[PDB]
């Protein structure tokens, strides 16, 4: 079975760290932060890593029953599985698959159904993934809502993410921090079973980021979100499970209608992409172009510079 990547343009693909489409390709230096996302992590032969799961509609969603914290508009969600089964903390994962992998204030809607009559309700809610109340590995997540009365106990409750917010009274774009991992156990202990941090280890090379713009719901948030692999690539590698004939796959970004190669990149076996470039650069590409696997190369392959 020969290795390959999907024939899908950037705009046809989805961010693997938030349920939104991809927008563009971006490269830049990543020496000043730790690049260790847990969503969108998958080896080229189809091994899912970190908290990565297969569908993008499950990224940053929560399910369970909620308990009101008395004297506040906050609720503690006792996490259920995506199945509505009880939560099991003994799985060899950092957190439930699809848990957010950045520190920030994720705003969305908390919906609930009353089992006996089918009555429903929905309220604005925000989860602060950097707080010690965010302990999804321990099976609990705190939501701040607009209500102190409406959500009932022991009823199926779901959080649908929409976007991120920022306190406009502080430095604009100071949050969220997409490269700061949450503490999945509410700051009680180390994160466990993480996908490793990635970094370009070839001179002149930088990471190639698949970038989207998270919706902003309030303030002046940093809405950039970079994933290391499109979700469709994760889905494709999982389905294909093609063996890696080396550590490094050579990809060419190709206009299928003019046949022209605009740049080449390295798809690393462990699941991330590097390009030969120095500095921050938004890649200007024909929207119909796609990535094409050309060959497996050795560790000392020099990429053509990416102008």
């Amino acid at each position, epitope marked *: 079975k020969p290795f390959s990547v999907p024939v899908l343009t950037v705009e046809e693909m989805t961010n693997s760290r938030f349920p939104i489409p991809l927008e563009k390709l971006f490269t830049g230096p990543s020496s000043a932060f730790v690049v260790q996302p847990q969503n969108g992590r998958c080896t080229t032969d189809g091994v899912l890593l970190g908290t990565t799961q297969l569908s993008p509609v499950n990224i940053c969603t929560f399910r369970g029953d909620v308990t009101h914290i008395t004297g506040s508009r906050n609720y503690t969600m006792n996490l259920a599985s995506q199945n509505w089964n009880d939560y099991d903390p*003994t799985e060899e994962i950092p957190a439930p698959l699809g848990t957010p992998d950045f520190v920030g204030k994720i705003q969305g809607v908390l919906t609930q159904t009353t089992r006996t009559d089918g009555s429903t309700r929905g309220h604005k809610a925000t989860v602060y993934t950097g707080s010690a109340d965010f302990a999804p590995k321990l099976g609990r997540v705190q939501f701040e809502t607009d209500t102190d009365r409406d959500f009932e106990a022991n009823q199926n409750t779901k959080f649908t993410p929409v976007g991120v917010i920022q306190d406009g009274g502080t430095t604009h774009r100071n949050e969220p921090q997409q490269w700061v991992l949450p503490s999945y156990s509410g700051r009680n202990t180390h994160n466990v079973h993480l996908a490793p941090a990635v970094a370009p280890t070839f001179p002149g090379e930088q990471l190639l980021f698949f970038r989207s713009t998270m919706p902003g719901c309030s303030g002046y948030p940093n809405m950039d979100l970079d994933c290391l692999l499109p979700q469709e690539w994760v889905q494709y590698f999982y389905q294909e499970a093609a063996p890696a004939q080396s550590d490094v796959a050579l990809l060419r970004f190709v206009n299928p209608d003019t046949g022209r190669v605009l740049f080449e990149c390295k798809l690393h076996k462990s699941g991330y992409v590097t390009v030969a470039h120095t500095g921050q650069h938004d890649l200007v590409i024909p929207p119909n172009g796609y990535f094409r696997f050309d060959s497996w190369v050795n560790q000392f392959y020099t990429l053509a510079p990416m102008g």
Partner: antibody
Amino acid sequence: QVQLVQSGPEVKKPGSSVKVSCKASGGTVSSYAISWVRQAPGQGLEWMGGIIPIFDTTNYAQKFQGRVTITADESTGTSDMELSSLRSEDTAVYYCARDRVPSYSPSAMWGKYGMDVWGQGTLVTVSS
Amino acid sequence: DIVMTQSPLSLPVTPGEPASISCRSSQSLLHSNGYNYLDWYLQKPGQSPQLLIYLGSNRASGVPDRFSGSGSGTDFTLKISKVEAEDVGVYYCMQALQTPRTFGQGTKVEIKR
């Protein structure tokens, strides 16, 4: 939620066999480890073995290996426990139980932990 | 097999007083994931057993706050802060680390007078 309903009481001669059922009602338990536990009149609780129905993976305590087989329906999780070559010491109440968390998730140690749904029990009397 | 050892085997309790049950394992029940694979079960008279504590110290759903589990490695304790009449029965600890799962002998809790 789901309840485990077991078959009625049994009276067997030694050397015979008995098959006790554990029906899943009001739900499915097929993705959970289902254990069979028995209580002899003089003893406490003893784990005989178990099955994860959707995997058809069984585990049997050494004491019962070769004389007990546990099977189960892949969709409902309803299970059967068949104990053969019965002896007087097999006179006991037999329970089926379900772990509190399933053993499958989408994407030396067996099953999970915390058996929180139990059948009502089945008395098996073995005597000549 | 892991040998589970409970103490005492017979526990008359005064309603309103606390109670404590000890359980020792022949080897450590502490997994690499940081959890102790120890459950507590209660079999009330004439009933099926029911789960009280799982993974050492986690209360099962619906278990009142007066029950608590603690301990680590080979030494565990079930605590009842205030015994009530409805708490009588036989309490079992059980390791879930290795197959076969093995129980303690059971601690029979009855009313002191």
